[PDB]
Write an enzyme that holds these catalytic residues in place. Structure first.
Site, PDB file in Angstrom:
ATOM      1  N   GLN A 150      58.819  48.859  -8.465  1.00  0.00           N
ATOM      2  CA  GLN A 150      57.727  48.361  -7.650  1.00  0.00           C
ATOM      3  C   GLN A 150      57.685  46.833  -7.676  1.00  0.00           C
ATOM      4  O   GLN A 150      58.240  46.211  -8.575  1.00  0.00           O
ATOM      5  CB  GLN A 150      56.434  48.909  -8.232  1.00  0.00           C
ATOM      6  CG  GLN A 150      55.518  49.614  -7.285  1.00  0.00           C
ATOM      7  CD  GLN A 150      54.522  50.455  -8.051  1.00  0.00           C
ATOM      8  OE1 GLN A 150      53.504  50.895  -7.518  1.00  0.00           O
ATOM      9  NE2 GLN A 150      54.823  50.695  -9.318  1.00  0.00           N
ATOM     10  N   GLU A 151      57.022  46.233  -6.692  1.00  0.00           N
ATOM     11  CA  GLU A 151      56.857  44.779  -6.632  1.00  0.00           C
ATOM     12  C   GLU A 151      58.127  43.966  -6.767  1.00  0.00           C
ATOM     13  O   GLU A 151      58.169  43.025  -7.560  1.00  0.00           O
ATOM     14  CB  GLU A 151      55.889  44.300  -7.726  1.00  0.00           C
ATOM     15  CG  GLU A 151      54.404  44.611  -7.509  1.00  0.00           C
ATOM     16  CD  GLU A 151      53.646  43.487  -6.801  1.00  0.00           C
ATOM     17  OE1 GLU A 151      53.777  42.308  -7.233  1.00  0.00           O
ATOM     18  OE2 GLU A 151      52.911  43.791  -5.826  1.00  0.00           O
ATOM     19  N   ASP A 152      59.154  44.317  -6.004  1.00  0.00           N
ATOM     20  CA  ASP A 152      60.412  43.573  -6.043  1.00  0.00           C
ATOM     21  C   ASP A 152      61.145  43.553  -7.390  1.00  0.00           C
ATOM     22  O   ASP A 152      61.600  42.499  -7.844  1.00  0.00           O
ATOM     23  CB  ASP A 152      60.192  42.121  -5.586  1.00  0.00           C
ATOM     24  CG  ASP A 152      59.752  42.013  -4.124  1.00  0.00           C
ATOM     25  OD1 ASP A 152      60.023  40.952  -3.514  1.00  0.00           O
ATOM     26  OD2 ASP A 152      59.128  42.969  -3.590  1.00  0.00           O
ATOM     27  N   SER A 153      61.248  44.717  -8.023  1.00  0.00           N
ATOM     28  CA  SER A 153      61.948  44.879  -9.295  1.00  0.00           C
ATOM     29  C   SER A 153      62.804  46.082  -9.017  1.00  0.00           C
ATOM     30  O   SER A 153      62.460  46.885  -8.161  1.00  0.00           O
ATOM     31  CB  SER A 153      60.995  45.255 -10.438  1.00  0.00           C
ATOM     32  OG  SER A 153      60.109  44.213 -10.815  1.00  0.00           O
TER      33      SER A 153
END
Ligand SMILES: [Zn+2]
Ligand SMILES: [Zn+2]
Ligand SMILES: [Zn+2]
Lengths: 266, 115, 65, 134, 46
Positions: D2-5
């Protein structure tokens, strides 16, 4: 025979297409996994470097050496260095190989997995043989060198499983499918126009009766019959990577009882 | 750097037991067993089987958080039936089914030709 | 930069096939698309592996001590 | 993820996927003083000053350097050097406190004005870990 | 038997001690490397 049955479709030295039927998906999977991860095997795991002039840096080489498959038929009769009582290691828990290469040739000399040289007493057992499937029988081009480039190191293969590091995994890819004609509705095809048209049928649609409109939705319909294909790297005979899979998992489920026992004393 | 040791995924650390059973106080006749150094492989399966003993009112399991190799298993059973047993059976069954699957796979195999 | 032993993705040995592939190209005068199929590299995880490696090691060797 | 990971296949990281090398090079020279006053490359100790480091000097040979196969770490000294002033004030070079690895290549040259010139090179393999960026 | 330093180009074991000039016995090439260690270094294999 009695419970979950099998029916080997094709079968070779490297794969074992087969139909696991009348089982629980959970189980099909449990095994599926156990195959990939917890089956014992041997591999180089320590590399003492005396001399290297290659262009590849020490650990670079060392890394590879761990992936070069090794013999593991009798692995089940070699102990885990950690459980053996030696101050570090012995023939009772490990194999020791060698590697010495010199750029004698006037043209790029080659170091291959075949150049390994067991030096520990294999106490008479199939173990530690640089598995070769190469056509010329040299398998795994470790590395290359020029003129006076030298490379002398020693290896120490130990037991170990895939969870500790992949180089111990024997599996390497496993085909797993079930209910080719989405009859249990375990998926929902994405489509632009037609599901059936845009989404390819599997070679397994055959071995199972097509849907056929009319019929209502089979909800009580569970899922048995899985079209698996267990490949192998060699360290172990494709058949084994399935029997030992079947077994390993069995022992784990076992230990849980055994645990419930000692725990019963008090 | 802050990396845990790879083997900790399966070697029970100094003073830990595979199992640890605590009686769930929320509901009656039901317990929670913690499996140390184990994962889905074992879990999902003992959960499935456990889901047949029609004397087993409840059964489910979860892996607390990825970082840690372990999972909790909650088993609730009908009166007079102790879950510890329910777990036992479901265990055996799995073994028995596997054993069969083994003989059988070997059967088919022996009756084959490689190329 | 020397062939990768085994496929990052599925683990299937691939360290040997380097030389074979290179001849099923220069000698046997075949196309990559299949020269690979020939070496048993079925699905792409393993394919992308050989099809892409850049054997820099050679340029390396070509230096001196 | 999530969130660019993202989640990264562990197995792949093992079989290799994305490992890299990493070299770094420390360097030093023997100061000269018009009125013939020079520094030196050696494995010192006490001798008045004690004005030295805290890292093991041991990994040090007698030329005041580290042999190329050595595994270095913490703040071990990678280079021994002393300055004369009125007897043994240190001037050695410890490995970057946060880094650690293996000496990879040492080399000793002269620098125009004939002083001793030297550069050490440590190498490290860095495997993709959880906080890593891609 | 033993050595110490080396030549960047005409790779040839050399060595010496203090104020022995920093050149090679042939190639002036004032560079020079330091040859591996006697100590055998070990490596994890993962
Ligand atoms: Zn031992
Ligand atoms: Zn692959
Ligand atoms: Zn020279």
């Amino acid at each position: 025979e009695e419970g979950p049955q099998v029916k080997i479709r094709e079968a070779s030295k490297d794969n074992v297409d087969f139909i696991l039927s009348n089982v629980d998906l959970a189980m099909a999977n449990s095994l599926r996994r156990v195959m990939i991860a917890e089956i014992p095997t041997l591999a180089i795991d320590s590399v003492e470097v005396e001399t290297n002039t290659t262009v590849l840096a020490d650990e670079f080489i060392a890394h590879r050496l761990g992936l070069i498959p090794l013999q593991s038929m009798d692995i089940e009769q070699l102990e885990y260095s950690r459980d053996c009582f030696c101050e570090d290691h012995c023939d009772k828990c490990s194999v020791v190989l060698t590697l010495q290469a010199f750029g004698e040739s006037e043209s790029t000399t080659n170091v291959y997995s075949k150049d390994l040289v067991i030096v520990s007493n294999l106490m008479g057992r199939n173990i530690g043989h640089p598995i070769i499937q190469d056509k010329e029988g040299n398998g795994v081009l470790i590395c290359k060198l020029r003129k006076g480039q030298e490379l002398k190191l020693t290896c120490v293969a130990k037991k170990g499983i895939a969870k500790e590091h992949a180089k111990w995994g024997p599996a390497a890819a496993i085909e797993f499918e079930y209910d080719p004609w989405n009859k249990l509705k375990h998926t929902d095809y994405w489509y632009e126009q037609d599901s059936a048209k845009e989404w390819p049928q599997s070679k397994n649609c055959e071995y199972e009766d097509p849907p056929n409109e009319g019929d209502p939705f089979d909800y009580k319909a569970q899922a048995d019959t899985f079209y698996m294909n267990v490949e192998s790297v060699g360290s172990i005979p494709v058949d084994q990577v399935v029997v030992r899979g079947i077994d390993t998992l069995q022992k784990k489920v076992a230990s849980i009882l055994l645990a419930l026992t000692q725990m019963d004393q008090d | 750097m802050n990396a845990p040791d790879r083997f900790e995924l399966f070697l029970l650390g100094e003073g830990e037991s595979k199992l640890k059973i605590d009686p769930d106080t929320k509901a009656p006749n039901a317990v929670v067993i913690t499996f140390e150094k184990e994962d889905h492989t074992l879990g999902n399966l003992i959960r499935a089987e456990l889901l047949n003993d029609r004397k087993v009112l409840f059964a489910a399991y979860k892996v607390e958080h990825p970082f840690f190799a372990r999972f909790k298993l909650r088993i609730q059973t009908t009166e007079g039936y102790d879950p510890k047993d329910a777990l036992k059976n479901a265990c055996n069954s799995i073994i028995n089914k596997l054993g069969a699957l083994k003989t059988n796979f070997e059967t088919e195999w022996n009756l084959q030709t490689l190329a | 930069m020397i062939v990768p032993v085994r496929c990052f993705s599925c683990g299937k040995v691939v360290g040997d096939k380097w030389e074979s592939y290179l001849n099923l190209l220069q000698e046997d005068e075949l196309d990559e698309g299949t020269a690979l199929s020939r070496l048993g590299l079925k699905r792409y995880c393993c394919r992308r592996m050989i099809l892409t490696h850049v054997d820099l090691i050679e340029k390396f060797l070509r230096y001196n001590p | 993820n999530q969130e660019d990971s993202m989640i990264m296949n562990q197995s792949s990281i093992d079989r290799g996927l994305f490992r890299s090398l990493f070299f770094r090079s420390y360097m030093d020279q023997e100061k000269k003083y018009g009125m013939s006053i020079t520094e030196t490359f050696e494995k010192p100790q006490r001798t008045n000053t004690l004005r030295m480091k805290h890292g093991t000097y041991d990994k040090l040979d007698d030329d005041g350097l580290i042999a190329p196969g050595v595994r270095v770490s913490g703040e071990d000294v990678i280079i021994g050097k002393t300055t004369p002033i009125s007897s043994k004030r240190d001037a050695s070079t410890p490995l970057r406190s946060t880094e650690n690895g293996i000496v990879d290549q040492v080399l000793v040259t002269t620098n125009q004005d004939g002083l001793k010139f030297v550069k050490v090179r440590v190498r490290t393999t860095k495997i993709p870990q959880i906080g890593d960026k891609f | 038997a033993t050595l110490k330093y080396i030549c960047a180009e005409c790779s040839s074991k050399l060595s010496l001690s203090r104020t022995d000039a920093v050149r090679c016995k042939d190639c002036g090439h004032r560079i020079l490397l330091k040859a591996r260690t006697k100590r055998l270094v070990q490596f994890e294999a993962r």
